[PDB]
Symmetry: C2
Subunit: 103 residues, 2 copies
């Protein structure tokens, strides 16, 4: 099971939120930023990472990458200006994406 932590270094404030928040679970989690497509975290397979456990990340519609973890997972998404997001679990390298504007 895994949680999602959000670090706002982008001055996003109340524009940035996790739903549902506060859980370490298997269920999908959604990081939302007003004006952009939600980033979905979920257990959509198959496992491609080398670690025991995984979290798949979708940037809007599209599969962005997969994260791996051991023990109780914590995927931390760090936001910086320009829609930059760095996502890391502490296993393997952090991975970057950019928020997609809703048109």
């Amino acid at each position: 099971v895994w949680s999602v932590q959000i670090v706002d270094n982008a001055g996003l404030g109340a524009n940035l939120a996790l739903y549902p928040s506060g859980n370490s679970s298997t269920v999908p989690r959604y990081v939302t930023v007003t004006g952009y497509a939600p980033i979905t975290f979920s257990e959509i397979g198959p496992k491609t990472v080398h670690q025991s456990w995984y979290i798949t990340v979708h940037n809007g519609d599209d599969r962005a990458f997969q994260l791996g973890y051991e023990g109780g997972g914590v995927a931390t998404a760090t936001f910086t200006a320009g829609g930059n997001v760095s996502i890391s679990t502490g296993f393997g390298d952090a991975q970057h994406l950019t928020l997609k504007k809703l048109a």
Copy 2:
């Protein structure tokens, strides 16, 4: 200002959710269905509808359509088999989208 209400006629149960709440405001609303791209409701312009006020709907990262309303808006999304969603404000015609699986 406007609210979103969801109606489960698809036996989704705990797999269907609305965020942040069913209350009225101008911020984005998000509807999630386990395993599918989330639906976003928000004021992404320009206004294409004939009504004074609008709510734009995105199916994942794609623009699905725009709803119009007068007075205090209520966008009601009704879910049926096959990930079929009918969305209406009671102004103009109801519009339809189909949920997309996250791959």
